[PDB]
Amino acid sequence: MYSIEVRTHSALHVVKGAVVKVLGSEAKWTYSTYVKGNKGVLIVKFDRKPSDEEIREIERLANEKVKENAPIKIYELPREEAEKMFGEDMYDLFPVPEDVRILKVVVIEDWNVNACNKEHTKTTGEIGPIKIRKVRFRKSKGLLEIHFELL
Numbered sequence: 001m002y003s004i005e006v007r008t009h010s011a012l013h014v015v016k017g018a019v020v021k022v023l024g025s026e027a028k029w030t031y032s033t034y035v036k037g038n039k040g041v042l043i044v045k046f047d048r049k050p051s052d053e054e055i056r057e058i059e060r061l062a063n064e065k066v067k068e069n070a071p072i073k074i075y076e077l078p079r080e081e082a083e084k085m086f087g088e089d090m091y092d093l094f095p096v097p098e099d100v101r102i103l104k105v106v107v108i109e110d111w112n113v114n115a116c117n118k119e120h121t122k123t124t125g126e127i128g129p130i131k132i133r134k135v136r137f138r139k140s141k142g143l144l145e146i147h148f149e150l151l
């Protein structure tokens with residue numbers, strides 16, 4: 001089976017996709033992410049605190065993607081090829097340093113594309129129900145934190 005950490009990290013990709021679907025391209029750049037147990041935190045560059053409605057919709061879409069049990073594809077490509085294939089969208093706010101010449105790219109079709117070297121579940125269904133616990137907007141820094149728990 002997959003550890004709760006691997007499942008929670010995989011959830012970050014699902015939640016990020018939902019975030020972009022609801023908030024739009026203005027929220028496409030991830031500042032950072034981290035997992036501790038069954039708790040995951042996604043921080044993206046954004047300019048406002050979403051409404052409770054928007055937060056609920058992000059949660060709904062995330063769970064719906066998990067329910068769809070879509071495959072989580074992993075691409076291991078030379079950096080140059082990865083860029084031609086996925087473009088800038090595969091990067092986070094801070095692009096992978098140039099000394100890294102081979103990239104592993106995670107892909108959830110029409111949902112999320114991200115250069116990531118961590119371990120993931122094979123499908124989104126293996127993640128399980130997700131619950132957003134806290135959302136915090138840091139105005140000065142222009143960062144939106146989404147704290148969730150994998151039930």
Ligand SMILES: [Zn+2]
Binds near residue numbers: 009117119
């Ligand atoms: Zn990942």
